[model samples]
Target: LDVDLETRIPVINKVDGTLLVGEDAPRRAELEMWLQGHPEFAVDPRFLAYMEDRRKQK
Candidate 1:
């Protein structure tokens, strides 16, 4: 759970554009859209909450 999530998902530096993480257009659009409608796989956990979660475990 501690690993950087970028490798597993589409996160990037170009900001809100749909082409942030891929070389292909259509496929990248799909990947970008995946994060748009499906936020369940996403995590924006604050560090404070993260500490609490970490504290509950080993």
Candidate 2:
């Protein structure tokens, strides 16, 4: 199975802690699934990916 690297996923901004609804909105499913599948990597790319790849999220 391939984790979606592209596309948007609902995420919470790590800095401000806000809910960010992805552009797809439907992609919300992937966030939940992706998070569950990659809790370890959560701190990896997710950190930056969710936070603007080290900068968007909510």
Candidate 3:
């Protein structure tokens, strides 16, 4: 079976919000994963500590 992957290109990513590209996404993912593994960021050290927090709280 041959599968054709349908990818929707992100034109909106270029539009002007906080865009994570090049080195940013990987770096952020690393830091986010770190905070996720520890409890320091879960409380109140920083506001909005990392990405996808409280994901499992739901």
- Residues 1-58, candidate 2: write the lDDT tens digits: 2435565655554455555555723254466676676443232245355456443244
Off by over 4 Å in 2: 24-58
Which residue pairs overlap in candidate 2's backbone?
Answer: 48-53, 52-56
In order, candidate lDDTs are: 0.41, 0.48, 0.33
Candidate 3 global lDDT: 0.33
TM-score of each: 0.22, 0.28, 0.22
User: After aligning candidate 2 to the native by TM-score, how far in Å is the CA of 47 from where it should be?
Assistant: 13
Better of 2 and 3 by lDDT: 2
Q: Please report the candidate that would top TM-score against the real structure.
A: 2
Better of 1 and 2 by lDDT: 2
For model 2, give the RMSD to the true fold.
12.2
Per-residue lDDT, model 2, residue 46, is 58
* Tens digits of per-residue lDDT for model 1, 1-58: 5434343333332344332333332243354566676544332234335547675446
